[PDB]
Enzyme design. Structure first.
Site, mmCIF file in Angstrom:
data_model
loop_
_atom_site.group_PDB
_atom_site.id
_atom_site.type_symbol
_atom_site.label_atom_id
_atom_site.label_comp_id
_atom_site.label_asym_id
_atom_site.label_seq_id
_atom_site.Cartn_x
_atom_site.Cartn_y
_atom_site.Cartn_z
ATOM 1 N N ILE A 1 10.954 16.496 2.491
ATOM 2 C CA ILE A 1 11.319 15.556 3.271
ATOM 3 C C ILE A 1 10.996 14.185 2.807
ATOM 4 O O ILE A 1 9.883 13.950 2.850
ATOM 5 C CB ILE A 1 10.973 15.743 4.849
ATOM 6 C CG1 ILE A 1 11.390 16.936 5.522
ATOM 7 C CG2 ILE A 1 11.739 14.404 5.547
ATOM 8 C CD1 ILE A 1 13.016 17.245 5.598
ATOM 9 N N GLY B 1 9.966 8.805 5.907
ATOM 10 C CA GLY B 1 10.563 7.539 6.494
ATOM 11 C C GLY B 1 9.736 6.380 6.334
ATOM 12 O O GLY B 1 10.080 5.339 5.805
ATOM 13 N N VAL B 2 8.357 6.283 6.133
ATOM 14 C CA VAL B 2 7.481 5.337 5.823
ATOM 15 C C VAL B 2 8.043 4.721 4.457
ATOM 16 O O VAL B 2 7.550 3.512 4.155
ATOM 17 C CB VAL B 2 6.082 5.470 6.322
ATOM 18 C CG1 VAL B 2 6.047 5.719 7.690
ATOM 19 C CG2 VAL B 2 5.459 6.523 5.357
ATOM 20 N N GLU C 1 8.886 1.245 2.697
ATOM 21 C CA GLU C 1 8.214 0.706 1.449
ATOM 22 C C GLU C 1 9.242 0.286 0.355
ATOM 23 O O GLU C 1 9.003 -0.855 -0.198
ATOM 24 C CB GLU C 1 7.190 1.588 0.999
ATOM 25 C CG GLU C 1 6.512 1.197 -0.142
ATOM 26 C CD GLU C 1 5.623 -0.004 -0.041
ATOM 27 O OE1 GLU C 1 5.357 -0.305 1.097
ATOM 28 O OE2 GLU C 1 5.345 -0.751 -1.062
#
Lengths: 144, 144, 144, 144, 144, 144
Positions: free
Chosen positions: B56, B59-60, B64
């Site tokens: 996966i 999300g972070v 970025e």
């Protein structure tokens, strides 16, 4: 129509990071052909070395990625590898590299089964970027 | 019409492997918007950890990559960073993650300049895969 | 009083290297709060890229580390993840980065459960170094 | 009599970790031949992926290492690369892999210049372990 | 006569990449001695750091590799580790480093059991390259 | 009063990732002593191998980190290394490992200059965690 995503790929091929080089299967017909995607990203570990200042996806890894895509065809068509068996790269004929593949390229690969001969299987592969051919080769693979 | 490939990106951003997350710039208009691509490949080092058996894209890391795409816009629009200066992530509002981004996805990111405010610059970003939104956020960045 | 060391952490979170960013739990009260440590070392792989000559722990990874610390709270409080389930980062509000976190910093993180709402859980987090706030954020997390 | 150790190699080839695959040059004669060593160690990063539980040095990396050994010959014989010039792998004929190469093997590679042709240079290579042939190939390389 | 290759090694030692530093066992006599090979390759991850421009195999990793080779002797002679048990490095006397070990070196290591004393086992080790001593040390190891 | 952060360290020592094992200098007195910190984090690359399921900071890396801390003292006290000069680990006496060092530990290292002898410099080091000794050793280092 017959797409495989990465978890399906991980179940078929034994290759793992940093040497699993098939990101998706777009289509296939068992015993005949398979069309796969390798996304080429700067964030892959070989690009630190190949080369500093000038990222070039190694031609040898296009051959590998295509050989992997033959393995996925072989396993879906003829049966999965049994524990401890492996899918050996035995030979290559007429590999030709047409131009460099680079970060941001989505490398579309098409492999076709040709014939079995001795206990080897012969495949042709063609890799494209933006509809143009970047690599061709004929590959021989064997299960031990 | 205004595309930047990886060498042009490496000359603009100071980020390097394994934290340079913009693979290509598809278009931009100085002071207004930039559209960039992040190719998501299994062969990226964070996928070993996130997660074993189930890749996966974090999300972070979408945040970025969009912040990096603001940096490229900022540098092309306002001037390159001077040696030792950095492009700092100061804040984020309303980041929303809509569904998982996965190996084989080409993540298309669109960033827009909103305004400058208290020594900070505000940007909105939207990331898409196959034409569908996977992430939105508002980002504040500063030079120092 | 209720400390968890890394093997206990590895049993709770599915994250692995290079994306497991909670090194120890100092204390927690189920359903309420958790206090965790992230040791920031030069010998972490992202610092090669972020940035050459000037190591700066990425703000986005503070958000991740805090989200991980919410997961550990969630699992200890409400039950462990079942095989194949995952702990999704759904959103972030009001992330603010106050100053750079660097090699040698021990980042102390405190997360507090706020409420459940839709099938999302809302948490606040605050990260400190040497008693001073370096990051705050509100995080929304969901089990699929 | 004409040996090159790693620092001399690093000055000749632009490849860096994790894609510099010549560890020493044992002898060479400019314009004619070069004999090089690739030490095969478990502690190389591709063995994690190729394959878990069963380390096999990739055949495609034997081709790479031999191509690199042609590069060293080419540079010593004809002149060093100029900054920004690259040593491109253009093609391969008749690569044959005879048996697996494994951790603890010292792979001795002999490359011979054949001829120049249409702006390409043709080389043959033979790789041995414990005096036995493990791979042969014909390689075409070009500067640009 | 009694050789172990890498899969046998992987079954005995718990060490994995990037800290498994025994590539082959050339011979051993249970309770007495073991002779092992560490192939030293540029393509090992520590050489990026140790040092840029000048690859030097760390002396501390020779001590480790020898300690590993004692573990393999201990396990073959006295029984395999049970799940969760580990083979602890407890002490070292008189480590001496004679000259640098480098890429292309095949490091031949000979460890000899001396005695048990307290719940520690004492071993001597000598590491050679091209028949010359590059390191000696006396090592104390314990199972917990 | 005399603290050095990572950029000051990078300017003194030639070690780089993944083998720079001093994260901060807390104090020092030229020619006498230096106190340094190594933050021990799960997100360090050797923990993948040492050991799967049970992270243990290698004792040999405590020796390395202390040797590096002697280097910083030596350079600040006696002069920086000249380009191409190296700080060589020549020997160790009486290294003792008292208990395992683990993720989340902040390892405080104190090194003291003892004397110069036959072109070598002798140092003692003591490493602590939470005020308790985890390792002691006597180290001999040389410039060349």
């Amino acid at each position: 129509t017959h797409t495989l995503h990465i978890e399906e790929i991980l179940d078929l091929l034994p290759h793992r990071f940093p040497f699993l080089l098939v990101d998706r299967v777009l289509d296939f017909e068992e015993g005949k052909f398979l069309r796969a995607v390798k996304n080429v990203s700067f964030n892959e570990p070989f690009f630190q070395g190949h080369f500093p200042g000038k990222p070039i996806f190694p031609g040898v890894l296009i051959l590998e990625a295509m050989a992997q895509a033959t393995g996925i065809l072989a396993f879906k068509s003829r049966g999965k590898l049994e524990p401890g068996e492996l899918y050996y790269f035995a030979g290559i004929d007429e590999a030709r590299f047409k131009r460099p593949v680079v970060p941001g390229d989505q490398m579309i690969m098409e492999v076709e089964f040709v014939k079995e001969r001795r206990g080897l299987t012969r495949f042709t592969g063609v890799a494209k970027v933006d509809g143009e051919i970047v690599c061709t080769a004929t590959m021989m693979c064997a299960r031990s």
